[PDB]
Amino acid sequence: DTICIGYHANNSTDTVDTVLEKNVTVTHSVNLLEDSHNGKLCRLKGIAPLQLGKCNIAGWILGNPECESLLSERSWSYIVETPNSENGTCFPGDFIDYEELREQLSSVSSFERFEIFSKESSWPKHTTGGVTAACSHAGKSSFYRNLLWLTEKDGSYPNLNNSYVNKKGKEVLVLWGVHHPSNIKDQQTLYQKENAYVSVVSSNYNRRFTPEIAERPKVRGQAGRINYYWTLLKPGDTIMFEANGNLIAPWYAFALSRGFGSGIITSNASMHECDTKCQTPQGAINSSLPFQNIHPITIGECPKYVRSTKLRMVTGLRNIP
Amino acid sequence: DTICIGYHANNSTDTVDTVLEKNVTVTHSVNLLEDSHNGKLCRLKGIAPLQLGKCNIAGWILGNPECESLLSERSWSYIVETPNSENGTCFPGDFIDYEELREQLSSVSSFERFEIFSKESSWPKHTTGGVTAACSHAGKSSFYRNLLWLTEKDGSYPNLNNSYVNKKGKEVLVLWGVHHPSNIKDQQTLYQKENAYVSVVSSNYNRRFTPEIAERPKVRGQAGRINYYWTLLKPGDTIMFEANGNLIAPWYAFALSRGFGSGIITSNASMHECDTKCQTPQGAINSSLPFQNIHPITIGECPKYVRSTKLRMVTGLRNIP
Amino acid sequence: DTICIGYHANNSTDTVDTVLEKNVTVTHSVNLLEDSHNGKLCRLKGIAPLQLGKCNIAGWILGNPECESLLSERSWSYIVETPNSENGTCFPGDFIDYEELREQLSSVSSFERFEIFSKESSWPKHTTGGVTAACSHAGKSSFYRNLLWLTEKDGSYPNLNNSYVNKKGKEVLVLWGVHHPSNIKDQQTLYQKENAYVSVVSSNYNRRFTPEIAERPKVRGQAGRINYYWTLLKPGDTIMFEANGNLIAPWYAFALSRGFGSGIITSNASMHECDTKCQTPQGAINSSLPFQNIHPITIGECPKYVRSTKLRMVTGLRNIP
Amino acid sequence: FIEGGWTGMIDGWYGYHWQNEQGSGYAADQKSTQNAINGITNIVNSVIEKMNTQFTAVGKEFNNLEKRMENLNKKVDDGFLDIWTYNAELLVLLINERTLDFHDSNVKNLYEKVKNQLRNNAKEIGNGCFEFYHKCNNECMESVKNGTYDYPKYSEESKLNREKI
Amino acid sequence: FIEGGWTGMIDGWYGYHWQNEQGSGYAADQKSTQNAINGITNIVNSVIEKMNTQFTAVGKEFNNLEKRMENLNKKVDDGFLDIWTYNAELLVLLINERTLDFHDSNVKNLYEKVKNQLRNNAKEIGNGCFEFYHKCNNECMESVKNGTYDYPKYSEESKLNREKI
Amino acid sequence: FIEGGWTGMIDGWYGYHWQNEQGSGYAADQKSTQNAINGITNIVNSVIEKMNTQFTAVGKEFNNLEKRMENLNKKVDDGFLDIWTYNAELLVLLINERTLDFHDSNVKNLYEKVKNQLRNNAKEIGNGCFEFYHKCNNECMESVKNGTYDYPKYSEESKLNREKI
Amino acid sequence: MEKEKELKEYAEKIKKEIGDIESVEVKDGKILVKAKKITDKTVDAIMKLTVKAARLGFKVEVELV
Amino acid sequence: MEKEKELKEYAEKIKKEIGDIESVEVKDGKILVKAKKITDKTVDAIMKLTVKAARLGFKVEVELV
Amino acid sequence: MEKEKELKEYAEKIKKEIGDIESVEVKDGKILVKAKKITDKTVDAIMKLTVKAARLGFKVEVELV
Ligand SMILES: *[C@@H]1O[C@H](CO)[C@@H](O[C@@H]2O[C@H](CO)[C@@H](O[C@@H]3O[C@H](CO)[C@@H](O)[C@H](O)[C@@H]3O)[C@H](O)[C@H]2NC(C)=O)[C@H](O)[C@H]1NC(C)=O
Ligand SMILES: *[C@@H]1O[C@H](CO)[C@@H](O[C@@H]2O[C@H](CO)[C@@H](O[C@@H]3O[C@H](CO)[C@@H](O)[C@H](O)[C@@H]3O)[C@H](O)[C@H]2NC(C)=O)[C@H](O)[C@H]1NC(C)=O
Ligand SMILES: *[C@@H]1O[C@H](CO)[C@@H](O[C@@H]2O[C@H](CO)[C@@H](O[C@@H]3O[C@H](CO)[C@@H](O)[C@H](O)[C@@H]3O)[C@H](O)[C@H]2NC(C)=O)[C@H](O)[C@H]1NC(C)=O
Ligand SMILES: *[C@@H]1O[C@H](CO)[C@@H](O[C@@H]2O[C@H](CO)[C@@H](O)[C@H](O)[C@H]2NC(C)=O)[C@H](O)[C@H]1NC(C)=O
Ligand SMILES: *[C@@H]1O[C@H](CO)[C@@H](O[C@@H]2O[C@H](CO)[C@@H](O)[C@H](O)[C@H]2NC(C)=O)[C@H](O)[C@H]1NC(C)=O
Ligand SMILES: *[C@@H]1O[C@H](CO)[C@@H](O[C@@H]2O[C@H](CO)[C@@H](O)[C@H](O)[C@H]2NC(C)=O)[C@H](O)[C@H]1NC(C)=O
Ligand SMILES: *[C@@H]1O[C@H](CO)[C@@H](O)[C@H](O)[C@H]1NC(C)=O
Ligand SMILES: *[C@@H]1O[C@H](CO)[C@@H](O)[C@H](O)[C@H]1NC(C)=O
Ligand SMILES: *[C@@H]1O[C@H](CO)[C@@H](O)[C@H](O)[C@H]1NC(C)=O
Ligand SMILES: *[C@@H]1O[C@H](CO)[C@@H](O)[C@H](O)[C@H]1NC(C)=O
Ligand SMILES: *[C@@H]1O[C@H](CO)[C@@H](O)[C@H](O)[C@H]1NC(C)=O
Ligand SMILES: *[C@@H]1O[C@H](CO)[C@@H](O)[C@H](O)[C@H]1NC(C)=O
Ligand SMILES: *[C@@H]1O[C@H](CO)[C@@H](O)[C@H](O)[C@H]1NC(C)=O
Ligand SMILES: *[C@@H]1O[C@H](CO)[C@@H](O)[C@H](O)[C@H]1NC(C)=O
Ligand SMILES: *[C@@H]1O[C@H](CO)[C@@H](O)[C@H](O)[C@H]1NC(C)=O
Ligand SMILES: *[C@@H]1O[C@H](CO)[C@@H](O)[C@H](O)[C@H]1NC(C)=O
Ligand SMILES: *[C@@H]1O[C@H](CO)[C@@H](O)[C@H](O)[C@H]1NC(C)=O
Ligand SMILES: *[C@@H]1O[C@H](CO)[C@@H](O)[C@H](O)[C@H]1NC(C)=O
């Protein structure tokens, strides 16, 4: 008669590491590192993302013709650009403080796109148009949807003078541009005066812009440039526009809501009907592990990203048959 | 006859945590986390702070009327703003590089406020004044104490031309402003010429300013703006002012000493006679523990801030009666 | 007859620390902290550094006379400034975005210095020269080697108009300057017109500069200023220069290669024939230890820098004779 | 003294193997297995709770004249990534050593429990087994496993057989 | 083997309880208590010395066009706060485990000290107590507590009584 | 029980000292020394491998109007330096404690190995030495050192001498 | 609220799927697991439950029936 | 200098207040505490003294009289 | 490639210099050291070899001949 003391063993091949020992075989282990994902874009907590299929933030917010379908979107959980998001500013120019605009838009989570200045009635003494070859759409010259290019009407460009009073409960994002022709003849043809100015002011904004006329290397076939500007109106503020010329007036503006957890990611993946609480550019994550090695950039409630390839902790005995 | 081996026990209820075990009762423990404070502002190492009771850094340095009492201060250990520090720039405008000025002032620890340009003799051919409703004080129009608003005298505004040679052993902080009227009539009334300039130069500074006249939304009842500028003179340098108009000339300047440990904090607490080696916006800390969970922002020699709610380390045995 | 169990001991005096114990004597230990260095500058992986003996990045890239010998250098592993690198911009002025230029140059690792605009033929209707006392060399007035100061020829300064098409496979760094005289008489003497402009444009660059004439404190004997500008041409881009005056035209430009591991360090040490895989301002490091306490700033594959003074780990027994 | 585990003990982490004239088999030591499971779950909860949820961490864009800021942002990202990879791997190593020492200590404590129960009524074998000098029926085995072994009840027989041996 | 501490031992951390025909009471083991206190103070000094004093850390202000820089500053602050909270709590857990193991090891070493002093002159009880076969007066108790127990002096009486028992 | 090491054992970390009628000297326990060296090398490789190579880390320049950015850069540098100094020193302390416990455990395990080999054929001395009751020649010493001690071969003589003593 | 409801649903799923577990009581910040046996299947289920409870603020305590 | 003087004042205060401590010698980077008994009061005082010495650069060693 | 060649050269140097080492086989991510004795000289050499292999991606295993 005898009684022995021992411990469990099984056919497991899980291996773990210690400081003294490596490749220790254990009966059971928990992998603290998540390395699998759906490989798809998913609805983050039930709300679909904003898919900028062909255009980047600049093209979407300025509303170039090649992603006109985005003008019907109102809300999202995150913004998705693709590696081939080429259609930005269809007309060449410097989008001033563009990265700051991206930072601001990363937290919006909803907007109302409303006509800030009516095309028909806001500019009765100016020509409303602006079709340009650089923004050609469907074989015809076109122009941004959210901007209005004002030019001389009936041989003159009278002093532009307009303002908007923010009657929303939300911040209003106003975007406009200043045209910088390539040569003085363009200036005279479009605005009928060589030295024009654009002035934009609000309670916390004060800028004056002057066109700079010079021959330039052609970008998208244009020797001119349009510099794109923007500002946010506080819920009760007023914005005033004055221009002697060279103004590409605001047409639509965005009344911005604000939220938490939104962001911008460059992703190659496809959209699908699945839901998720965590999203990465490669795909959604569907586990409660503490660490992951899928992608540094995550949206939602996600595991901490580490360079490790395996993080197994012991939850069992040494396996020594 | 017998002899037993054992260990101490008592009526302690201190509890600690381990990786394997939680809520372990121990005879004695040391709480490494400081969570109590005086709840007052104290003299940091014997020197009282600078209490900007009603005004923020901008109002104090520009010296608006509503915190005129601060003009008698010369030294401090730290600067205290309050959550209701509303009285900044009494006249609306953009304080250029204001955050950089805050960063510079956070390390001053002492200044001499001296009259850089005498009001009576420095501007014999210009009108010295500048009372404005926006800076109304005690029922009367007033203006900053450290700035001097120059306007036309006897129907003209001759070319302004003045300079200061830094004869201190310390950096001199010079502040000035440029006036941007709302309409051309203000420009003609004050400066008698539509196109004026302000030019400020030193060995390591070179700026030219031009007024920008445009109707603006009213802030504090003013449709105009004053942009506020500043620069530091190196101990041996010279600063030269030229202006055809629109200059709000420097009147007082600060010869700045430099120190270590100073900072700016927004605090609601009251000042008291106590001393301390550590200060937080909520109150002073009076312990030598390594960690604290009182406030992220600290001045002096303070414990490391952590989100933990309890950090007890064992300094005794398991308490198991 | 007896058999005893014991362990090794020796005459070692190595000491280590634990949480419970301090000054524990051990038979053998490994010092994980590197604290010794060659005390020399060495060839990092076989390539010598760029030694700016007397001048800093500004003087080297602008090519002031006092470090003319650097114009024969083409490649390096890292850039070395010395604590006495005084000869920067020999003519006073603001080197615009100079720190960004340092950041860009820290990763170049090679350049070709080529004559972007021929001195003899590129400016047939302007005077090519620019000797100034501020950049005096060997007892005579001189000027930068990489910049060409254009002035009026035969009583006029015709409209400057030149461009360069980047035919390299590499980015081309173009540097130029704009002259800001002290008084209007200098403007008339040099450029024959009071109001001149400089305009520089490329596919991704658009600036216009205007001279600002004002009396200034003398720096190096000059009451004028030259602001220094720069831009990078993308491998296929074109850069166009237009100027009515005040242009200090580009003469030599750098076709930049790019690399990894390069950097800029301020060092007092001497160059020597030794090789190394790690370099610090104090001297080269020649060990494979994980940590070092020599200098925060390192170039190459170097140990992690820590404030520790000793990091000894036990690789033996307690030494208790 | 215990060399290798048992592949047959399909229930429990630590336990007993026994044989007598009535039967043989394996049985788990419920108290020690329960304590071990609770300790392991405490370790897991410490590992996961002390890690905060990572919230939205999308990157930033910088223009051609903000290279210093871009490099500072990348420096912050790389430094935090290095620190957290180091923390994760070091934590895994430390908790693995702690857990394996914990299991070894549990097995040793169970062995000492049996030894203290049996005193000198059984011959201690240096392989993790005890040989009873007295015959130990199923009731005796159950008593030993539950820590209620009646030592004096078997003292006479155990001493007689030990002296005989 | 020792289940629970003594509420009566008001002096010292580890010590002895004894009783004989002359008296009874508690007494601290000065050497082991001293070493334990020194170790605990070393742990405290390691915890506090290795933490640097936190100096002035006031925040920065950013304007409406510096949102990226503001978010980078907040990111640095939050990352350092997370790392330091993790370090503090992990350090507390590690040092608590180390300290409790240290105290348990000290008690075990004291028990082994007494056992080695007594050899086979006392019956070892599996609860942390030794019963002398020979009568042990106050001088004997003091000798045992001080580690100077004269084993051969009591060998004859201890063997006689052990054989009798 | 083992107080201090041997200065004469010039070969091996842990080993044996022995003496009989044929000779005396020291000898290393090759298996335990080999395992200890492998463990120490594993510790060293864990310490060094888990540290990444530090690549070029030259500082940045800022102008007089970028003081906030300069202070943020210096804050990042100082925070990372503090965190890494703390990590380095804490890691050194932890691995030193682990290594010293590892060596002590190895010595204890070797002692237990010898004890299990010898059973009751030798008198256990509370200083790390075993005194054979039977005469142990060089072959016996080699058998004990290699863990192949033939216990029954010496049982009769050991029991006879132990009873005589 | 939502976390506790999700844990309750998961606990019901586990109690249905794993026959070696008697019950799983989610309540007041802790999940009380009453296991009848400790096998590989049960240990895997319990460790999955522990990982699930973490970051939901619930500790797991296991009782062996 | 100042740190040592402050520690000397604190040590004098402790030696006056805690009757179970014989003396507290601050010197040459270490504080030597000569305790007569180790009770809850004395342990609390010694741990407070250890926390006080830390960040003042002084180690604490305790001797039991 | 280059790392393995450098380690091979260093191992040859060690095997030549340290007479207590039989051989040093650098191969397939690990260096196998076959030592004849473990003395202070040999331990120092082996620890130097271990530090050298680290950051070159090679583990060190020691066999006692
Ligand atoms: C929206 O994005 C697409 C893709 O970037 C644009 O189409 C691309 O436009 C470029 C520039 O016009 C084309 O490159 C040019 O091709 C011509 C020959 O056709 C050549 O002479 C030029 O030197 C240059 O290489 C490119 O081929 C074209 N790609 C495709 C697939 O159409 C499009 O113009 C953008 N439209 C808007 C409104 O943003
Ligand atoms: C110093 O700070 C105080 C507090 O901010 C200033 O007083 C406040 O001034 C504002 C603006 O003038 C007042 O709001 C206005 O009230 C009028 C009616 O009186 C209303 O018509 C406006 O639309 C606006 O709401 C505010 O009531 C007033 N508060 C108090 C307690 O007086 C003060 O003007 C500042 N002075 C200087 C020199 O900085
Ligand atoms: C290259 O760098 C050297 C060293 O910085 C320059 O030489 C230094 O130039 C300064 C300014 O001209 C000299 O200081 C001046 O000295 C005169 C008297 O000679 C005094 O009247 C001024 O008030 C001022 O103090 C300095 O002495 C001189 N040092 C040496 C050793 O020559 C040099 O000018 C630079 N050259 C170029 C082309 O960058
Ligand atoms: C021991 O651990 C090492 C490192 O973790 C494992 O290394 C692998 O070994 C195989 C066989 O030689 C190679 O094919 C792989 O390329 C190695 N991987 C790496 C990352 O180096 C090794 O497999 C482990 N051995 C056991 C038995 O678990
Ligand atoms: C054991 O530790 C836990 C967590 O630290 C303590 O949790 C508290 O428990 C009480 C009683 O259920 C609740 O009222 C509190 O709200 C809990 N606090 C938290 C933060 O969860 C628990 O009190 C401890 N128990 C003992 C006996 O120490
Ligand atoms: C014990 O460790 C301490 C701290 O590491 C050592 O402190 C030195 O002590 C000597 C002698 O008193 C002084 O001259 C030094 O200035 C001390 N150095 C520091 C940094 O404080 C001490 O030397 C060590 N003692 C032994 C025997 O190793
Ligand atoms: C392990 O053993 C179990 C029980 O016999 C069996 O069901 C399972 O398939 C085995 N797994 C492997 C990988 O052999
Ligand atoms: C034009 O400006 C005047 C004030 O100068 C203003 O009253 C008027 O409303 C402006 N016109 C429009 C269309 O806003
Ligand atoms: C992106 O998706 C396309 C379409 O599936 C595929 O061809 C391409 O390889 C993908 N690229 C990356 C980097 O995932
Ligand atoms: C996660 O994966 C499991 C297993 O495939 C699945 O049952 C569950 O529905 C997934 N959860 C989500 C939110 O997709
Ligand atoms: C603990 O016991 C001591 C000694 O009897 C007594 O003075 C003290 O008041 C007690 N404390 C509590 C909380 O019971
Ligand atoms: C005016 O400028 C001249 C030089 O143009 C200078 O000499 C004079 O001092 C200046 N006037 C004053 C009051 O500084
Ligand atoms: C600030 O102090 C006032 C006056 O004591 C008090 O009424 C208010 O609640 C305080 N607010 C905060 C946030 O401390
Ligand atoms: C800290 O608090 C203690 C206890 O209230 C007090 O005696 C001491 O004076 C305080 N120290 C300071 C600097 O206020
Ligand atoms: C240590 O002992 C060895 C062997 O006797 C000897 O060679 C060496 O010089 C000694 N070192 C010191 C520092 O005494
Ligand atoms: C001057 O400009 C014209 C275009 O206006 C251009 O054709 C010509 O090449 C330019 N001259 C030079 C020398 O580049
Ligand atoms: C720099 O080098 C010079 C020449 O060797 C020497 O005189 C000087 O002390 C050094 N300074 C520093 C800070 O190393
Ligand atoms: C490193 O130092 C050793 C010893 O002085 C020397 O043999 C070796 O050549 C050095 N290595 C380099 C790369 O300088």
Numbering used by the authors:
A (entry chain B), B (entry chain A), C (entry chain C): 11 to 331
D (entry chain H), E (entry chain G), F (entry chain I): 9 to 173
G (entry chain Y), H (entry chain X), I (entry chain Z): 1 to 65
What does the paper say about this structure?
To compare RFdiffusion to previous binder design methods, we performed binder design campaigns against five targets: Influenza A H1 Haemagglutinin (HA), Interleukin-7 Receptor-ɑ (IL-7Rɑ), Programmed Death-Ligand 1 (PD-L1), Insulin Receptor (InsR) and Tropomyosin Receptor Kinase A (TrkA). Full BLI titrations for a subset of the designs showed nanomolar affinities with no further experimental optimization, including HA and IL-7Rɑ binders with affinities of roughly 30 nM. We solved the structure of the highest affinity Influenza binder, HA_20, in complex with Iowa43 HA using cryo-EM. Raw electron micrographs revealed a well-folded HA glycoprotein with clearly discernible side, top and tilted view orientations suspended in a thin layer of vitreous ice. The 2D class averages further show clear secondary structure elements corresponding to both Iowa43 HA, as well as the HA_20 binder bound to the stem. The 3D heterogenous refinement without symmetry revealed full occupancy of all three HA stem epitopes by the HA_20 binder. A final non-uniform 3D refinement reconstruction with C3 symmetry yielded a 2.9 Å map of the HA/HA_20 protein–protein complex and corresponding 3D structure that almost perfectly matches the computational design model (0.63 Å, Fig 6f,g; the sidechain interactions at the interface are very different from the closest structure in the PDB). Over the binder alone, the experimental structure deviates from the RFdiffusion design by only 0.6 Å. These results demonstrate the ability of RFdiffusion to generate new proteins with atomic level accuracy, and to precisely target functionally relevant sites on therapeutically important proteins. A high-resolution cryo-EM structure of one of these designs in complex with influenza HA shows that RFdiffusion can design functional proteins with atomic accuracy.
